[PDB]
Structure 1
Amino acid sequence: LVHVASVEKGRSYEDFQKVYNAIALKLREDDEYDNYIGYGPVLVRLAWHISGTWDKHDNTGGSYGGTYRFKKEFNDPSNAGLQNGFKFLEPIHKEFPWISSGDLFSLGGVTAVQEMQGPKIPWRCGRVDTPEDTTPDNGRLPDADKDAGYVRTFFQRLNMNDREVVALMGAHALGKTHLKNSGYEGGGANNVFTNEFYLNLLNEDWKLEKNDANNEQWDSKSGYMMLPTDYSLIQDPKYLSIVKEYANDQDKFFKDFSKAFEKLLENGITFPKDAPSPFIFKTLEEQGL
């Protein structure tokens, strides 16, 4: 099963920079969302969940087809809460009706990372909406109550290795858990992209507690939390070495995160050899906007 990227007709870098800017301006405007976290973290999570349905074995799922717009996928229990990100993107799609849905959802995650002062993430256009019958079934996104061996195995289906997994999980510096979405609560309110996930894992005094949904999670007195799958990255000795590396080198973490996140968002897509090169969008701040 082959999905070839096909550039939205006549569009070039500056068209996609305008879409990035509209998302970025709306992220700046709609600042109250989720007790003033803003929409950045939920847009990163949306970009990951629309990508994380991919299965390397048969090229089902993945960001290409934009299938989150269909009820089966947007009602996946694993996706509870992402409707807020979709609703944020709706006026953007209305203004720029020419962009495909997979391009819009993935570009929303790139825009959110960069505007939250994260690394530049190269991004490629050309995902093409596919029909409702191509929507993957629920159950392809990962459980949070499991251990390191579950995380390692899970991510092999997405063609990610230990370094890529530990880099990607760094996005859990952003936002928070919400009991009504996932059965986990807490984590604070961070909307600045840093390597603090790794520093918090190594430096906080973590206690294994039951939350109000009767699920276990690791909590610190500073108000941070770790899922069991987050904490597994310091229980497994191979993950632990990489956690230490990113805790001690912000630039390395940025560079590895940017490569793994682009890869995640591009899994399943064949880029023709004369496709445009990846675009690197300027932030609003770099443009003086």
Structure 2
Amino acid sequence: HVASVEKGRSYEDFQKVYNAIALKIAEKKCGPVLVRLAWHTSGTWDKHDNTGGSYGGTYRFKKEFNDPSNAGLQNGFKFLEPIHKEFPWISSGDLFSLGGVTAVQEMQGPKIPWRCGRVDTPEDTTPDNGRLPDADKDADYVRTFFQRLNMNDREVVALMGAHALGKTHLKRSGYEGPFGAANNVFTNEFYLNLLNEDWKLEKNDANNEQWDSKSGYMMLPTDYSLIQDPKYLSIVKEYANDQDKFFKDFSKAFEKLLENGITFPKDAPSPFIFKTLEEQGL
């Protein structure tokens, strides 16, 4: 899949799209669902045959937006609709991925370089449901799962830190509760809370197991597996003790996730680094 720049567009065009998304996030407090949308639209990728991935923007098709794994992301899509209406020239893959970048940055997360040029592909290119991960599994599951995305242990642990941004909803996923204290702010608190809170393995009202802290947080079985495996645990401790290292590693892993499957020509533009609304005085 060769990246092809939307005709005649440059950094300033994409900064205008960024800003419109950023204003929407401030308006609706929809940062977390847009991060999740960027991840799910990218996370269908299979390194073995280059199916799925962010390039084709196939979430716009029924099979994918109706994936049970994507329950709730329709809200994010809906919030992007006015942006795509104002900027109809941007491809769907570019919009979904840029939505995630914008959301991380606007929630005071790291800068995430972003490259344009994803191109819409037809409905028959939509990947089947079942490529996104299960939450009821263990560290071995997680490690194996993420090999299909070409992610190693450090990349996995870093990416999972995005959980502290938001919450689980029983009706959507079968899990209920906030993942952290810092709702709508990107921090390293996922790691700190895993190490420092008092966690109990309980059943929620959907009869699924989750880990609950007295402070009112929860963790999925796959989240908690990062302190049950000794290789993951050492990285959890590293990020709990170095906010900057976490931010830099997250940025790299998230850009990689959003770019898997895409061939950027040698004369493609460099990755863009968008200014936040705060940085622009907006």
TM-score of the aligned structures, taking structure 1 as reference length: 0.95
Runs of 4+, deviation exceeding 4 Å: none
2:201 partner SS: strand
Q: Separation in 2 of the partners of 1:169 and 1:124?
A: 22
Change (3 A) 1:247 1:188: closer
Q: Separation in 1 of the partners of 2:212 and 2:181?
A: 11
Deviation (angstroms), 1:78: 0.2
Query: Aligned runs of 1:85-104 on 2, under 5 Å?
Result: 85-104=76-95
Q: Separation in 2 of the partners of 1:47 and 1:26?
A: 16
Q: Separation in 1 of the partners of 2:166 and 2:228?
A: 24
In the other structure, the counterpart of 1:12 is 10
Say if 1:64 and 1:127, in contact at 8 Å, map to a contact too.
yes
Q: Separation in 2 of the partners of 1:126 and 1:224?
A: 39
| Equivalent residues, number | 275
Q: Separation in 1 of the partners of 2:140 and 2:41?
A: 24
Deviation (angstroms), 1:189: 6.4
Change (3 A) 1:250 1:188: closer
Say if 2:33 and 2:73, in contact at 8 Å, map to a contact too.
yes
Q: Separation in 1 of the partners of 2:182 and 2:58?
A: 30
Of 145, 151, 154, the match for 1:160: 151
Say if 1:65 and 1:102, in contact at 8 Å, map to a contact too.
yes
Deviation (angstroms), 1:188: 5.6
- Cα deviation per residue 1:74-121 (whole Å; 9 max; x = unaligned)? 000000000000000000000000000000000000000000000000
Q: Separation in 2 of the partners of 1:246 and 1:26?
A: 30
Q: Separation in 1 of the partners of 2:181 and 2:117?
A: 36
Say if 1:176 and 1:189, in contact at 8 Å, map to a contact too.
no
Question: 5+ residue gaps in structure 1?
Answer: 28-39
1:163 partner SS: helix
Q: Separation in 2 of the partners of 1:71 and 1:174?
A: 27
Q: Separation in 2 of the partners of 1:180 and 1:85?
A: 16
Q: Separation in 2 of the partners of 1:198 and 1:213?
A: 26
Q: Separation in 1 of the partners of 2:148 and 2:41?
A: 15
Deviation (angstroms), 1:231: 0.2
Q: Separation in 2 of the partners of 1:174 and 1:118?
A: 10
Q: Separation in 2 of the partners of 1:189 and 1:248?
A: 17
Percent identity of the aligned residues? 98
2:246 partner SS: helix
1:269 partner SS: coil
Q: Separation in 1 of the partners of 2:181 and 2:91?
A: 34
Deviation (angstroms), 1:199: 0.2
Q: Separation in 2 of the partners of 1:115 and 1:74?
A: 25
Say if 2:55 and 2:93, in contact at 8 Å, map to a contact too.
yes
Say if 2:164 and 2:182, in contact at 8 Å, map to a contact too.
no
Q: Separation in 1 of the partners of 2:182 and 2:19?
A: 24
- Cα deviation per residue 1:15-39 (whole Å; 9 max; x = unaligned)? 0000000001111xxxxxxxxxxxx
2:136 partner SS: coil
- Cα deviation per residue 1:37-92 (whole Å; 9 max; x = unaligned)? xxx00000000000000000000000000000000000000000000000000000
Q: Separation in 1 of the partners of 2:63 and 2:11?
A: 33
Question: 5+ residue gaps in structure 2?
Answer: 26-30
Say if 2:164 and 2:181, in contact at 8 Å, map to a contact too.
no
Q: Separation in 2 of the partners of 1:189 and 1:245?
A: 20
Say if 2:165 and 2:183, in contact at 8 Å, map to a contact too.
yes
Q: Separation in 2 of the partners of 1:208 and 1:84?
A: 30
Q: Separation in 2 of the partners of 1:250 and 1:189?
A: 15
- Cα deviation per residue 1:142-168 (whole Å; 9 max; x = unaligned)? 000000000000000000000000000
Say if 2:135 and 2:222, in contact at 8 Å, map to a contact too.
yes
Say if 2:20 and 2:83, in contact at 8 Å, map to a contact too.
yes
In the other structure, the counterpart of 1:63 is 54
Say if 1:175 and 1:188, in contact at 8 Å, map to a contact too.
no
TM-score of the aligned structures, taking structure 2 as reference length: 0.97
In the other structure, the counterpart of 1:31 is none
